[PDB]
Amino acid sequence: HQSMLNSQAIDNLRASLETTNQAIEAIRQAGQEMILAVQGVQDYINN
Amino acid sequence: HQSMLNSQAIDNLRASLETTNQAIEAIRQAGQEMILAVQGVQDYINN
Amino acid sequence: HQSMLNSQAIDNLRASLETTNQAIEAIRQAGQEMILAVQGVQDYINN
Amino acid sequence: ISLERLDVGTNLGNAIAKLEDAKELLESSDQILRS
Amino acid sequence: ISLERLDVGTNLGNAIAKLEDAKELLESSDQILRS
Amino acid sequence: ISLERLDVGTNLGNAIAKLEDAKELLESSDQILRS
Ligand SMILES: [Ca+2]
Ligand SMILES: [Ca+2]
Ligand SMILES: [Ca+2]
């Protein structure tokens, strides 16, 4: 019994962490797009 | 014994992951504020 | 047996979460550097 | 006549969309954790 | 006379505060993991 | 003669490097999860 519940809870955590890692990747990509926007402001100013 | 220790360790991981998810949300909100700052620089330049 | 497999899987999750937390810290530091870049654009405009 | 205008709205809009995608994934993770 | 000045310091300051909030939450998560 | 130019390339380059460091750490985390 407790080892079965613990397996189930481990599966739960693994699914959550996989999902969390996808959230992080989305924020990382948002950051790349923000860097491109600031580069675009700099280029407009230097022209 | 080992199943009790494993339950305790699962509780530990769950608490950590919940906390990690709140950290991520704070960074996501920082990103929204950075987007607003870059929009404010663009508006100032177009005026 | 199942309690040993569950211990091993907990070790796996812990290693992943520790790694995930380092990824988050890197994104947090990227955000600090982006804030400094936007501050630099503002200072250049006010001069 | 179109005047020259600063428009970084594409990159900012892509960032806004990605931060919304992250919010939905965090909500899914937190759903899983509560359950 | 006040001259017009670019000031996005509110939004940048809000971002700085949120990134500090994230640092404290990451430290709490890492505390929990070490224990 | 050097003309005055806006250059926030240091901070933007540091951000780009940190986001690459994050990508490698996420890949390592996802490696561990798949295994
Ligand atoms: Ca979407
Ligand atoms: Ca605070
Ligand atoms: Ca590197």
UniProtKB/Swiss-Prot annotation, chains A, B, C:
Residues 1-29 form a coiled coil. This is Fusion glycoprotein F1. It comes from Measles virus (strain Edmonston) (MeV). The lineage of its organism: Viruses, Riboviria, Orthornavirae, Negarnaviricota, Haploviricotina. The chain holds residues 138 to 184 of 550 of the full protein.
